[PDB]
Design a protein around this ligand. Structure first.
Ligand SMILES: COC(=O)[C@@H]1CS[C@]2(c3ccccc3)c3ccccc3C(=O)N12
Lengths: 539, 414
């Protein structure tokens, strides 16, 4: 009942050798149980009884199930594995509903024994030997080695998928109209043929596989649409988001809050209306996971709002290669971005949110370019295409910014969509000195060790100032200088500084940063009607 | 017959990941590969092979067809060593032409044991299908062991054209052949055809002018009247420049800045202060002494975006000791695509670089890794790929080099 499938050449890691771990002792109950399960496998050709001619071993653990609650079998190959060659990384990236195309009908075959069905490389079998213990470790144990892909073995997933692919090859060509997806033990089949035809084609596949050993279970195990695909319910002509339930408890532990926020966060993608601020202030100063933190009123609130939100149903449409692929983005708050990708207005294939990007120093447009790139990459992955962007920024602003930004940046084909708030340049340093406006020669200095300093200015007009600072830094005294010049000056100002950090501001003009200082400066910059900032060598 | 080929000691084959590709590029690659498979150049492989190397589809002018491009960079580095001392005279021809002799490789089989390491992957949309895994059976374009193992064959095929035309240099690099002669624009092209035609009777099928390349100097401004700001900016530029020309001095000039006057306030240039500037200009009339290309050190290419489609770059191995420097203006059709301009500029520098020291420079790119990795390939046209790192352009570097001189009027190209 094995197979006529060619085996894959498997080799041990470079210079390593097979495992040699003594067998764990088990009860008389667990022994007859394994002697059971196993005595079966030997017949089905899955395993072959071997003698002390094999220096290798792997521990076997007998544990019951919940289905028949009878003793099952478990083999720990953890050792053999880390002694087993590296294979080709198996599909870790799965399909996404938004990239699927509508089908007339979809099925799903469960190639359960997918593993014990595919033969193991004849030479490698020797290493997959395990020993069935004896009562009281008395007489010797019964040796066994796998002939098939062992469940839990490193090579098993990749070697089964391969075999599966080779097996499906002919069927794939004998009829393109039928799209097939292998996922672990599952084969998901879809087509745009009428149900009668499809069902028949399914049957054909089933018997074709059976022509290679691989069999499909009965009517009891069979799965029927819609399918639960990573948070989604897949209907052949539509996807619906699987409703997520938020527990209704009276005492929340830290673990509980952290697992709640996680859920909330993922939901945030499909539902951009979700909030978690108030649930996130609860983890403050927490001393232990099992700690019980009482939900504040605010936490009790948003937790509620989210429930009703998560009530609303969210369904979707599949990808029509024939229509436009569009992607619209919204700036939902400094560094917070929302995007919905669609084809038919108001009919999303996919929505999403990017965490609040918060780095050392950027501006809202560069952040927009980043949101835009990520969506591009996701899109290329999901549809092998790049959506047409609808962005809340004016072609003018875009043009002004990038054409002159120090860094190469880009936004694929895109169109302006006037949906407030639009992203804009919060300010623009003058290109040239401002005639008329006051000139603040600023300078801050501090003993980096004592952390004492002075930040001040002397204008050409006569105005001057100096403030002593404690527990500061040179960077901060310098920035404190520029900051004072900004407060004490009118709507137009010229500031000359030797601050190297200034120079960075001049070339990147950040409208947000990690330091509250630069932040203050930025707020001041945003207020002025004109600001010319100039650098000069220090000392 | 195949020559034995190994990796460097203790160096394992590349296990690099395949970037996602557009539908059109996948469709094209699948086509290109089914045929190479048909033609016995590559073969499908199993899960036992853990290796992988990036691939994509490019498309140079005069083509509706797509070319497959494998990024053997990682592999090339791990590939054992084995080329020519480079024709120092190449950098002198009135006009050089590049040739893609990449196909002259599938003829030669690849040592059976090295095949695994050439494993590549044709990605699938939405992960709906696992990759179509392959590996080469022949010498692959883009691999460095190829031009080597096929050297002699290339030697024998070129001589006849070489002797008939000794006033024409034939330098090879990767899948490329650079032909440079001093014949007139027409008498030169007709010669390429003769070399190609000659090359044509086998399995092989860019026009630059090295002697035109001139390392331009730095030109300090000469305002009508100078303001405080004017000087402050000049001093900074000059002061930073000190690092390259230790003779450049800002002493006097800096003394005209000992006043808290308006930035727009005009300042009179003292006689001494003008001498100082005069001398700095002198010092800046020629490339610094002592710069010698070391073939035992990596060639470094750094670029800065000067905005408005303009780019500047320096090729060097030591800091501030430039072997070459230049300004690059974007090409027609790229007004709104920094990435395109960048890859173009990057390809030019490489090309110039190849011509001069016969090897590619490690590049320093003023672009974000994500932005580059997502779109460079969409405008790549060369058969080779240089090494690169992404960096933040320092404010002064850009300010100092946008300073270089440009044509009096242009090129007067009637
Ligand atoms: C990707 O195309 C396929 O191979 C398969 C075939 S079945 C599946 C599918 C099932 C499970 C996971 C992923 C897809 C599907 C279901 C619902 C609507 C369309 C499709 C489709 O084309 N998919």
């Amino acid at each position: 009942p094995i197979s006529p499938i060619e085996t894959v050449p498997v080799k041990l890691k470079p210079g390593m050798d097979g495992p040699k771990v003594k067998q764990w002792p088990l009860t008389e109950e667990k022994i007859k149980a394994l002697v059971e399960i196993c005595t079966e496998m030997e017949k089905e050709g899955k395993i072959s009884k071997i003698g002390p001619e094999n220096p290798y071993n792997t521990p076997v653990f007998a544990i019951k199930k919940k289905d028949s609650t009878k003793w099952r079998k478990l083999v720990d190959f953890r050792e053999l594995n880390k002694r087993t060659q590296d294979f080709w990384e198996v599909q870790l990236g799965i399909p996404h509903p938004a990239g699927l195309k509508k089908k007339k009908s979809v099925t799903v075959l469960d190639v359960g024994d997918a593993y014990f069905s595919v033969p193991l490389d004849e030479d490698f079998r020797k290493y997959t030997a395990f020993t069935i213990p004896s009562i009281n470790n008395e007489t010797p144990g019964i040796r066994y080695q796998y002939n098939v892909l062992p469940q839990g073995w490193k090579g098993s997933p990749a070697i089964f998928q391969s075999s599966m692919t080779k097996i499906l090859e002919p069927f794939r060509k004998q009829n393109p109209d039928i799209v097939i997806y292998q996922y672990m033990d599952d084969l998901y089949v879809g087509s745009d043929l009428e149900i009668g035809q499809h069902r028949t084609k399914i049957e054909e596949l089933r018997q074709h596989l059976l022509r290679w050993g691989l069999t499909t279970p009965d009517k009891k195990h069979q799965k029927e649409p819609p399918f639960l695909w990573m948070g989604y319910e897949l209907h052949p002509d539509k996807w619906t988001v699987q409703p997520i339930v938020l527990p209704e408890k009276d005492s929340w532990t830290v673990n509980d809050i952290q697992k709640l926020v996680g859920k909330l966060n993922w939901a945030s993608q499909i539902y951009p209306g979700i909030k978690v601020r108030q649930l996130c202030k609860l983890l403050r100063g927490t001393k232990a996971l099992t700690e019980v933190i009482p939900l504040t009123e605010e936490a009790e609130l948003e937790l509620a709002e989210n429930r009703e939100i998560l009530k609303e149903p969210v369904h979707g449409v599949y990808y029509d290669p024939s229509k436009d692929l569009i992607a619209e983005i919204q700036k939902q708050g400094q560094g917070q971005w929302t995007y919905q990708i669609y084809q038919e207005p108001f009919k999303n294939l996919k929505t999403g949110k990017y965490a609040r990007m918060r780095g050392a120093h950027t501006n809202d447009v560069k952040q927009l370019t980043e949101a835009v790139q990520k969506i591009t990459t996701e899109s290329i992955v999901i549809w092998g295409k790049t959506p047409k962007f609808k962005l809340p920024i004016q072609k003018e602003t875009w043009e002004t910014w990038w054409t002159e930004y120090w860094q190469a940046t880009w936004i694929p084909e895109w169109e302006f969509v006037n949906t407030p708030p639009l992203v804009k340049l919060w300010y623009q340093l003058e290109k040239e000195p401002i005639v008329g406006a006051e000139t603040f020669y600023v300078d801050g200095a501090a003993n980096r060790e004592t952390k004492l300093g002075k930040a001040g200015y002397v204008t050409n007009r006569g105005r001057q100032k100096v403030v002593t600072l404690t527990d500061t830094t040179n960077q901060k005294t310098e920035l404190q200088a520029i900051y004072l010049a900004l407060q004490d000056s009118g709507l137009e100002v010229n500031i000359v500084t030797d601050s190297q950090y200034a120079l960075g501001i001049i070339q990147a003009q950040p409208d947000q940063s990690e330091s509250e200082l630069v932040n203050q400066i930025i707020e001041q910059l945003i207020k002025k009607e004109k600001v010319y900032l100039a650098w000069v060598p220090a000392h | 017959e195949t020559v034995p080929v190994k990796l460097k000691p203790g160096m394992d084959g590349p296990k690099v990941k395949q970037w996602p590709l557009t539908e059109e590029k996948i469709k094209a690659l699948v086509e290109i590969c089914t045929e190479m498979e048909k033609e016995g150049k590559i073969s499908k492989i199993g899960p036992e092979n853990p290796y992988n190397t990036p691939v994509f589809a490019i498309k140079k002018k005069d083509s509706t067809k797509w070319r497959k491009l494998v990024d053997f960079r990682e592999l090339n580095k791990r590939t054992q060593d084995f080329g020519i001392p480079h024709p120092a005279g190449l950098k002198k021809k009135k006009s050089v032409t590049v040739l893609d002799v990449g196909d002259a490789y599938f003829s030669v089989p690849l040592d059976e044991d090295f095949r695994k390491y050439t494993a590549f992957t044709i990605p699938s949309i939405n992960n709906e299908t696992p990759g179509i895994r392959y590996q080469y059976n022949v010498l692959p374009q883009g691999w460095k062991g190829s031009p080597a193992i096929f050297q002699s064959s290339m030697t024998k095929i070129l001589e006849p054209f070489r002797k008939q035309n000794p006033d024409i240099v034939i330098y090879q690099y990767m899948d490329d052949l650079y032909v440079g002669s001093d014949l007139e624009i027409g008498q030169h092209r007709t010669k390429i055809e003769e070399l190609r035609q000659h090359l044509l009777r086998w399995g092989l099928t860019y026009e630059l002018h090295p002697d035109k390349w001139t390392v331009q100097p730095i030109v300090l401004p000469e305002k009508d009247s100078w303001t405080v700001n004017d000087i402050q900016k000049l001093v900074g530029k000059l002061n930073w420049a000190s690092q390259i020309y230790p003779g450049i001095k800002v002493r006097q000039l800096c003394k005209l800045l000992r006043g808290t006057k308006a930035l727009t306030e005009v300042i009179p240039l003292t006689e001494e202060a003008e001498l100082e500037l005069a001398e700095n200009r002198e010092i800046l009339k020629e490339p610094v002494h002592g710069v010698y290309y070391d073939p035992s050190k990596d060639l470094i290419a750094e670029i800065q975006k000067q905005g408005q489609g303009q780019w500047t770059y320096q090729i060097y191995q030591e800091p501030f000791k430039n072997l070459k420097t230049g300004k690059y203006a974007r090409m027609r059709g790229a007004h709104t695509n920094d990435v395109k301009q960048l890859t173009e500029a990057v390809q030019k520098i490489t090309t110039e670089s190849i011509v001069i020291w016969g090897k590619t420079p490690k590049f320093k790119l003023p672009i974000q890794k994500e932005t580059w990795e997502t779109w460079w390939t969409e405008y790549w046209q060369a058969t080779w790929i240089p090494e690169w790192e992404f960096v933040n352009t320092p404010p002064l570097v850009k300010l100092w080099y946008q300073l270089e001189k440009e044509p009096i009027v242009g090129a007067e190209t009637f």
